[PDB]
Every structure is written in structure tokens, then in C-alpha cells.
Design a binder for this molecule. Structure first.
Ligand SMILES: [Zn+2]
Length: 255
């Protein structure tokens, strides 16, 4: 599976039938339709004690992994019950600035989309959590092109080291707090992973307020390769999945 003409999103349902399931992601967030729910609590992001280990090019994107053996980087509050631990953060981007985000707002597509993945500690490991309906929590942050994101630069400079599929690099002392917007106002709804196996185990929390990145930051993302080293070069662009039918589900807003 991939993002090309022959193995793209429109073909995933042949290997992964859940692809056409009842609670697929991403979705188009309709702001006039999203319901303001007063019973939603503020988000609780505790990331001061986070411990990054590495960055890798898994052939469909780049992931920064964290030590999730203890409650070091955690998410709680919001629509969530219990503590969810930070395991990884990844991005989805386009060939152009006009596309890249997975989630959309009023049909508006952003330059890229950052996902912070967390798993419910009640289930013991990441692999058990993806077998559950309340198994994961993904924080979605929209990136727009304007000014540079200081906090983003350490990631930017290491992409050269992981250009191709299978590459990884030591990535310690990275502080995720540098990627967060000023506001934690959000939208929430029940969905799934945006890549195979599209397990319908996620509680989405999409931040209203996007982060701005400079043109040159996003440019380095586009220099990544889908392919493995020693193979024809396929730029890693448009690694995003198109909006899926809402189908009954309701999107709640914390504002
Ligand atoms: Zn993602």
C-alpha cells in the first residue's frame, strides 16, 4: 500500500476492508454543524518529561519515537477517560502548499498535518490498545505557511540523515512542547488510524488553531523519499488520505 495511482487510498479497501467502515478518518470538519458541548473539559498536555529516542523514515512518512515505558509524556482531560501516553508524532504533507492536511475545516486543506499519537495506559501496551475503541488518542495540529517555527527546526535539520526508506537516526532531547499552538481549543470525534490497518480505535482531537511554518521548512519535507536507498527516486509528497464520510457521527467542539 502507498499513495500512488496504483496503490493509493482508493485501493486500500482490497487489503483492509475496514477502509469502508463506519468510523473512518480523516473527515471534513463542518464548523456550522459541529456541536458546542459544555461538558468538555480542557485538554491536559503534560510533556515536560518527554524522552525522544529517534527518527525514522518508514517509507510512508517520518516518525519521532518516544520512550513510553513510564508516564513521561501524557495527555488527559478533554473527552478522554484515563491517561494516554505519547508513543510517536508524524506528519502528512503535500506537493504544494494548497494541500497536505488529512482533516479539513469547511473543506479547507492546510499545508500539512502533525499527529501526536497516544495509547490508553489501561491496556498495557500499544498493541493491545489498537484492539480497543478508546485505545488511542491522536492530537491533530494543522500547519500553515507563514513564518518559521523555531521549535520545528531540529526536525528539519535531521531529514537529510533519513532521506530513504528504512533509515533511522538517534533523536534525543526533542521537546514536543515547541510544536504546540497557543490555544488548545479543539474539535473531537470518534475515528480511526489514517493509514492501514485503519483500525477504528481513535478518539480524534483536532486543534482549531494551526501552527505556521516557513516555506523552506516545509520544502525540506518534500525532499524525502518513499523509496529505499539504491532505487528509482520517488519523492515523499502527498502522503495524506482523503476525507471519509462522517456517517451519523457527530463532531463536538470545546468552544
Ligand atoms: Zn499521522
Amino acid at each position: 500500500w502507498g499513495y500512488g495511482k496504483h496503490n493509493g487510498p482508493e485501493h486500500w479497501h482490497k487489503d483492509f476492508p475496514i477502509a469502508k467502515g463506519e468510523r473512518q478518518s480523516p473527515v471534513d470538519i463542518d464548523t456550522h454543524t459541529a456541536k458546542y458541548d459544555p461538558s468538555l473539559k480542557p485538554l491536559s498536555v503534560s510533556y515536560d518529561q518527554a524522552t525522544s529516542l529517534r527518527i525514522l523514515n518508514n517509507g510512508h512518512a517520518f516518525n519521532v519515537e518516544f520512550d513510553d515505558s513510564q508516564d513521561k509524556a501524557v495527555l488527559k482531560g478533554g473527552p478522554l477517560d484515563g491517561t494516554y501516553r505519547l508513543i510517536q508524532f508524524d506528519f502528512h504533507w503535500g506537493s504544494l502548499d494548497g494541500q497536505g492536511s488529512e482533516h479539513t475545516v469547511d473543506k479547507k486543506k492546510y499545508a500539512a498535518e502533525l499527529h501526536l499519537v497516544h495509547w490508553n495506559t489501561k491496556y498495557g501496551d500499544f498493541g493491545k490498545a489498537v484492539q480497543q475503541p478508546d485505545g488511542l488518542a491522536v492530537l491533530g495540529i494543522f500547519l500553515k505557511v507563514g513564518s518559521a517555527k523555531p521549535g520545528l527546526q531540529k526536525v528539519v535539520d535531521v531529514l537529510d540523515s533519513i532521506k530513504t526508506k528504512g533509515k533511522s537516526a538517534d533523536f534525543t532531547n526533542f521537546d514536543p512542547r515547541g510544536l504546540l499552538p497557543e490555544s488548545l481549543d479543539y474539535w473531537t470525534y470518534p475515528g480511526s488510524l489514517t493509514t492501514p490497518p485503519l483500525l477504528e480505535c481513535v478518539t480524534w482531537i483536532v486543534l482549531k488553531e494551526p501552527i505556521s511554518v516557513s516555506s523552506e521548512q516545509v520544502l525540506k519535507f518534500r525532499k524525502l523519499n518513499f523509496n529505499g536507498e539504491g532505487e528509482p527516486e520517488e519523492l515523499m509528497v502527498d502522503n495524506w488520505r482523503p476525507a471519509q464520510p462522517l456517517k451519523n457521527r457527530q463532531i463536538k467542539a470545546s468552544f
